[PDB]
Amino acid sequence: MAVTEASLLRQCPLLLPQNRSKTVYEGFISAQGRDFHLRIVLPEDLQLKNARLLCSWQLRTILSGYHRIVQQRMQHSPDLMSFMMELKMLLEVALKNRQELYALPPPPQFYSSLIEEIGTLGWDKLVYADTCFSTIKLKAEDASGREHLITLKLKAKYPAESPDYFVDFPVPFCASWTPQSSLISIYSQFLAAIESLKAFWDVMDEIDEKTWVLEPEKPPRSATARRIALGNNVSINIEVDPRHPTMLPECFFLGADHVVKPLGIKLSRNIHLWDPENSVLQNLKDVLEIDFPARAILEKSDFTMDCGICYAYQLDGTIPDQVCDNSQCGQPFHQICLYEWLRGLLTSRQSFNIIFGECPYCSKPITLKM
């Protein structure tokens, strides 16, 4: 309703006015099928510019990082009615965010069905299950003999709504979810995607084996990019279409302008002799009229010796100088980039010509002396 005599009943059923002069309300407030104790003292008139509001310590843990919010809302909100709307809305927010603490599953469907269904698959399949039982991650095999993993993140109702599927491989995966579908169903869909992309995988595996793939290190199955090295201090980066893998990619070369120019010319001249009945390597070798190095150096292949903020060597004369005092990062930077960076952080403090604060990559103490 308009007025907060019926509208306040309808929108706060469990707030029982104790006093005749409706100054103390007491009892429960509702949110996400959960009721909370709440005791809300007004002054002698209906003015929230001055009011008390006490809570259960339950509710106060759940209003943590909102205290100023609520105090401002008491001062800024015209009526009690709207105040309660704002307060519920804010509870709404608070719980859904802290979703890790709050999940009472209906066992009779859940924990039994999930067991039945993992039995339906086979027990070699499942590889990880979380003790909140929210996450699972499953395994599948190629005709090749490659493992590909699938994460599922599951809700209070598994069989009702979709399970959130998180997947590696580079085309967007489609799972037709019904209430009738189950783990075996989405698993068969996932196998279908595997056996479909078989060619693209063979291309990637063939490359990684018979060449010095250099930049993506331990490649995922999602990566379309392969910065291959060849000769010395020249490289080719090659971005591939999965749907037509053997077909021609967008490509270009890094290194010496005097070394690369001839290869570009030669490529532009032989590029009509690309053929999607050969392999990518068997096309590249005879198009560019070359053989590749199979790991000319496997230990000191390359460590990216660039700024790790701006990713340039030679920013206005300056060199990658300032490093991390850490064995696991070692990452060089620039004087300019690291100063601009650390000034900005809240963790940074500046002494006379010194700036203390966190390495961008590893969050360990790093010192900059201007």
The per-residue b/e assignment along 77-92, b for 16 or more CB within 10 angstroms, e otherwise, is beebbebbebbeebbe
| Residue 315 interacts with, from Zn ion, another protein, none (CB under 5-8 Å by kind) | Zn ion
For position 304 contacting another protein by CB under 8 A, the verdict is: yes
Report whether 287 contacts 274 (CB < 8 A). yes
Residues in 301-330 that interact with Zn ion by CB under 5 A: 307, 310, 315, 324, 326, 329
Task: Give the span between the Cα atoms of 315 and 312, in whole angstroms.
Answer: 6
For position 95 contacting another protein by CB under 8 A, the verdict is: no
Q: In what order do the strands lie in the sheet with 15-17?
A: 15-17, 24-30, 35-41, 54-55
Question: What minimum distance in Å lies between the beta carbon of 213 and another protein?
Answer: 12
Between 226 and 334, CB nearer to Zn ion: 334
For position 250 contacting another protein by CB under 8 A, the verdict is: no
Residue of 11, 28, 41, 278 that binds another protein (CB under 8 A): 28
- Is 132 annotated to bind ligand? no
For position 361 contacting another protein by CB under 8 A, the verdict is: yes
Radius of gyration of the chain (CA): 31
Question: What minimum distance in Å lies between the beta carbon of 134 and another protein?
Answer: 9
For position 258 contacting another protein by CB under 8 A, the verdict is: no
Whole-angstrom CA distances from 314 to 92, 201, 275, 320 are 52, 38, 40, 8
Question: What minimum distance in Å lies between the beta carbon of 343 and Zn ion?
Answer: 15
For position 128 contacting another protein by CB under 8 A, the verdict is: yes
For position 290 contacting another protein by CB under 8 A, the verdict is: no
For position 102 contacting another protein by CB under 8 A, the verdict is: no
CA angle centred on 125, ends 119 and 128, rounded to 5°: 100
| Residue 35 interacts with, from another protein, Zn ion, none (CB under 5-8 Å by kind) | another protein
Residues in 40-59 that interact with another protein by CB under 8 A: 57
Residue of 46, 198, 362, 365 that binds Zn ion (CB under 5 A): 362
Task: Give the span between the Cα atoms of 253 and 235, in whole angstroms.
Answer: 6
Question: What minimum distance in Å lies between the beta carbon of 135 and another protein?
Answer: 10
| Residue 216 interacts with, from Zn ion, another protein, none (CB under 5-8 Å by kind) | another protein
Task: Give the span between the Cα atoms of 282 and 280, in whole angstroms.
Answer: 6
Stretch that binds another protein, among 163-171, 190-198, 259-267, 287-295 (CB under 8 A): 163-171
Report the largest interatomic distance among the alpha carbons of the chain, rounded to a whole angstrom: 95
For position 89 contacting another protein by CB under 8 A, the verdict is: yes
Question: What minimum distance in Å lies between the beta carbon of 61 and Zn ion?
Answer: 36
For position 111 contacting another protein by CB under 8 A, the verdict is: yes
Element (H, E) at 147: strand 147-153
Q: How many CB atoms lie within 10 A of CB 211?
A: 20
For position 123 contacting another protein by CB under 8 A, the verdict is: yes
For position 226 contacting Zn ion by CB under 5 A, the verdict is: no
Residue of 160, 298, 346, 370 that binds another protein (CB under 8 A): 346
- Which residues does residue 167 pair with via DSSP β-bridges, in sequence order? 150
Whole-angstrom CA distances from 102 to 32, 65, 134 are 10, 18, 12
Task: Give the span between the Cα atoms of 49 and 74, in whole angstroms.
Answer: 6
User: Which residue precedes each gap in the chain (C to N above 2.5 Å)?
Assistant: none
For position 157 contacting another protein by CB under 8 A, the verdict is: no
φ, ψ for residue 339 (rounded to 5)?
Answer: -65, -55
Residue type, 369: K
Element (H, E) at 232: none
Binding-site residues from annotation for Zn(2+): 307, 310, 324, 329, 334, 337, 359, 362
Residues of this chain that interact with Zn ion (CB under 5 A) are 307, 310, 315, 324, 326, 329, 334, 337, 359, 361-362
